[PDB]
Structure 1
Amino acid sequence: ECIILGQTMSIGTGSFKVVKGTNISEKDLVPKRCLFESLSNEAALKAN
């Protein structure tokens, strides 16, 4: 019922998957930030 629907069968060759490594590190995946909320959270709690 995968050759009728045109799907790949679960046995033989389609018993696994190949996926491609992105070869990326955690240094490029950083939340870059400069003076966004450095004071907008500071000037909202003074005596209120």
Structure 2
Amino acid sequence: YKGEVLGITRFGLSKMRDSVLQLASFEKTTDHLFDAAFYMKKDAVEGVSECIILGQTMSIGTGSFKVVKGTNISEKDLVPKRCLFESLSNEAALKAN
């Protein structure tokens, strides 16, 4: 996936995969935690192993798409309304300026 045969075993698993949570979820937890925090990795919240820790809704799978309902209403009634409070009193200051 990146440049070469690598990965699997922890030592190659630092390749692209950027999520410090799961990199600790496998092997060499500690030095990934610290050594991470030192280098101040900006990280991201993405993978399964990621998103179950923080416990929010999974990215892929069932959650691979948002669900939406339509309001099903016409913009005809979205038109504004007034008696034009502004417009009638406009022309007072329009003189001598």
TM-score above 0.5, yes or no: yes
Which TM-score band applies after superposition, normalised by the shorter structure?
A: 0.7 to 0.9
What percentage of residue pairs aligned between the two structures are identical? 100
- How far apart, CA to CA, are the structure 2 residues paired with 1:41 and 1:34? 13
SS at match of 2:64: coil
Shift of 1:28: 1.0
Larger CA deviation: 8-17 vs 29-38: 29-38
Structure 1 gap ranges (5+):
none
CA RMSD after TM alignment: 1.4
Could you report, residue by residue, the CA deviation over 1:1-46 in whole angstroms, capped at 9, with x for unpaired residues? 1111111111110000111111121111111011312221111112
Matched residue SS, 1:10? coil
Number of residue pairs aligned between Structure 1 and Structure 2: 48
Q: Tell me the TM-score normalised to structure 1 length.
A: 0.76
TM, length-normalised to structure 2? 0.44
SS in 2 for 1:37: helix
Give the structure with the higher percent helix: 2
Structure 2 unaligned blocks of 5 or more: 1-49
Pick the structure with greater CA Rg: 2
